[PDB]
């Protein structure tokens, strides 16, 4: 197949794709938007 290093982003195994989709960064969400409160 391909080498471990390539020029075309080398689409991943579906398990790895699910892992990356599940381990994404989630920013914190304040209870009330900062602009609304005084």
């Amino acid at each position: 197949g391909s080498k471990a290093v390539t020029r075309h982003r080398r689409v991943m195994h579906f398990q790895r794709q699910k892992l990356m989709a599940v381990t994404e960064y989630i920013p914190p969400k304040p209870a009330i938007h900062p602009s609304c409160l005084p």
Binding site: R9, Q15, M20, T23, I26, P27
Partner: protein, 222 residues
């Protein structure tokens, strides 16, 4: 009235002699007779060398792996030397001259019959390595413009950075890491072999933490 602030003074920065970029030769003075394999690992993962400023305050930072060859070297050196100010800015290399020999077989050749003759030389570069550094009694905006110009023409992703810019990026990366709100981390799962994920992952992923894919680096990956 508009309030005014003191200008950042430059009384503690001295430009060195020969402020322009040194010529870079395509091939080493002593050519390598023995041909080496394509150890593609020298562009994989984060850079362990030339990651921090030494004398200047601005630089070109690589955000991905790749090979620099003589055309790239000439492009960056010519653009920098024709776009900088010798009396107030100095530029210094941070990548060695091309030393890795790339061999190619003759055109229209079938597979087999030994390796090919050495054709040219390249400089491997990893993500996170400074390629050219800049210093002097100048602000960042002009150098940022005409250095992003050069960085857009590199074989990999690149940016124009400063000391404060790079420090800010690193602190924001740490802040994102600590305030990440989901409880499932690539590092945790990979190191604990959760779900048996090591059958899909790589032995390098334990240290790459999911932030590196081949010669590509994801700065938003956490």
């Amino acid at each position: 009235v508009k309030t005014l602030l003191p200008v950042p003074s430059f009384e503690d920065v001295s430009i060195p002699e020969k402020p322009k970029l040194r010529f870079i030769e395509r091939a080493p003075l002593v050519p390598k007779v023995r041909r080496e394999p394509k150890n593609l690992s020298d562009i994989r993962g984060p850079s362990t060398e030339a990651t921090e400023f030494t004398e200047g305050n601005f630089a070109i930072l690589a955000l991905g792996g790749g090979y620099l060859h003589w055309g790239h070297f000439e492009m960056m050196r010519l653009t920098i030397n024709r776009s900088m100010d010798p009396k107030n800015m100095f530029a210094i290399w941070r990548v060695p001259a091309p030393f890795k020999p790339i061999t190619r077989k003759s055109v229209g050749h079938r597979m087999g019959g030994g390796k090919g003759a050495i054709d040219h030389y390249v400089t491997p570069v990893k993500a996170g390595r400074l390629v050219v550094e800049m210093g002097g009694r100048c602000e960042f905006e002009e150098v940022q413009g005409f250095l992003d110009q050069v960085a857009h023409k590199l074989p990999f992703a690149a940016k124009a950075v400063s000391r404060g810019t790079l420090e800010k990026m690193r602190k924001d990366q740490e802040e994102r890491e600590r305030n990440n709100q989901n409880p499932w981390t690539f590092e945790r799962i990979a190191t604990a072999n959760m779900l048996g994920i090591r059958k899909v992952l790589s032995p390098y992923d334990l240290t790459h933490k999911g932030k590196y894919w081949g010669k590509f680096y994801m700065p938003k990956r956490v």
